[PDB]
């Protein structure tokens, strides 16, 4: 398809200080949080690969995994997670009001297309 959407929680882990949420580079840990990232990452690997348990009671995601109920929108060319934009799996910027407007226009066009010339992806998916 040309669109998919979901609500958290998403899989969260850390590699080389980089926090990944839904496979996107959400934020990077510094200072006294670095070791916390290491412990968490270990916990995630143990929970997932050894216990075969992905429940938060096992993984215990720290607050740096972001809001556990944030929304994700996937378009052709880019994705929005929470209020952050990613292109080619790289953070671009925080969404602006205009960006949110494009998201709703796209959702409304996808709806139109469904009951129906598919909508083009939001302009922010380019460059």
Swiss-Prot record:
<keyword id="KW-0062">Aspartic protease inhibitor</keyword>
<feature type="disulfide bond">
    <location>
        <begin position="47"/>
        <end position="65"/>
    </location>
</feature>
<dbReference type="GO" id="GO:0005576">
    <property type="term" value="C:extracellular region"/>
</dbReference>
<comment type="similarity">
    <text>Belongs to the protease inhibitor I33 family.</text>
</comment>
<keyword id="KW-0646">Protease inhibitor</keyword>
<dbReference type="Pfam" id="PF06394">
    <property type="entry name" value="Pepsin-I3"/>
</dbReference>
<protein>
    <recommendedName>
        <fullName>Major pepsin inhibitor 3</fullName>
    </recommendedName>
</protein>
<feature type="disulfide bond">
    <location>
        <begin position="12"/>
        <end position="58"/>
    </location>
</feature>
<keyword id="KW-0732">Signal</keyword>
<keyword id="KW-1015">Disulfide bond</keyword>
<keyword id="KW-0873">Pyrrolidone carboxylic acid</keyword>
<dbReference type="GO" id="GO:0019828">
    <property type="term" value="F:aspartic-type endopeptidase inhibitor activity"/>
</dbReference>
<feature type="disulfide bond">
    <location>
        <begin position="78"/>
        <end position="125"/>
    </location>
</feature>
<feature type="compositionally biased region" description="Pro residues">
    <location>
        <begin position="117"/>
        <end position="127"/>
    </location>
</feature>
<keyword id="KW-0964">Secreted</keyword>
<dbReference type="InterPro" id="IPR038412">
    <property type="entry name" value="Pepsin-I3_sf"/>
</dbReference>
<comment type="function">
    <text>This is an inhibitor of the aspartic protease pepsin.</text>
</comment>
<dbReference type="InterPro" id="IPR010480">
    <property type="entry name" value="Pepsin-I3"/>
</dbReference>
<dbReference type="InterPro" id="IPR051901">
    <property type="entry name" value="Protease_Inhibitor_I33"/>
</dbReference>
């Amino acid at each position: 398809f040309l669109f998919s959407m979901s609500t958290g929680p998403f899989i969260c882990t850390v590699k080389d200080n980089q926090v990944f949420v839904a496979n996107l580079p959400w934020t990077m840990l510094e200072g006294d949080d670095i070791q916390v990232g290491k412990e968490f990452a270990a916990r995630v690997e143990d929970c997932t690969n050894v216990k075969h348990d992905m429940a938060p009671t096992c993984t215990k995601p720290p607050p740096f995994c972001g809001p556990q109920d944030m929304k994700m929108f996937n378009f052709v060319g880019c994705s929005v997670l929470g209020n952050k934009l990613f292109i080619d799996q790289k953070y671009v910027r925080d969404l602006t009001a205009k960006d949110h407007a494009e998201v709703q226009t796209f959702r409304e066009k996808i709806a139109a297309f469904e009951e129906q010339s598919p909508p083009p992806p939001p302009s922010f998916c380019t460059v």
